[PDB]
């Protein structure tokens, strides 16, 4: 509808504010990968597990580069 597109406005804004936060801390995730991580964070998920798996998978795309 309209107010659910105004909710789409309040999510498109936050997805850019976190994109500023992502580059001043210079994480390797681009907007596409961060788009999977924000949906995960909505469901409730341990960042102490997720950061270990991201530091594992980034250690395997520079080992198979």
């Amino acid at each position: 509808a309209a107010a659910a597109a105004a909710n789409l406005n309040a999510v498109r804004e936050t997805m850019d504010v976190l994109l500023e936060i992502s580059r001043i801390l210079n994480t390797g995730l681009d907007m596409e990968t961060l788009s999977i991580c924000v949906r995960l964070c909505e469901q409730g998920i341990n960042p102490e597990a997720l950061s270990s798996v991201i530091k594992e998978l980034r250690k395997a795309t520079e080992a198979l580069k």
Binding site: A5, A6, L8, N9, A10, V11, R12, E13, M15, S35, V38, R39
Partner: peptide, 23 residues
Amino acid sequence: LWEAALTYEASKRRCWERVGCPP
């Protein structure tokens, strides 16, 4: 789903009669 729909479009005009991010 929400970031699929996130890439929607909006108009260039911004309202002088609505404040709070008018699209």
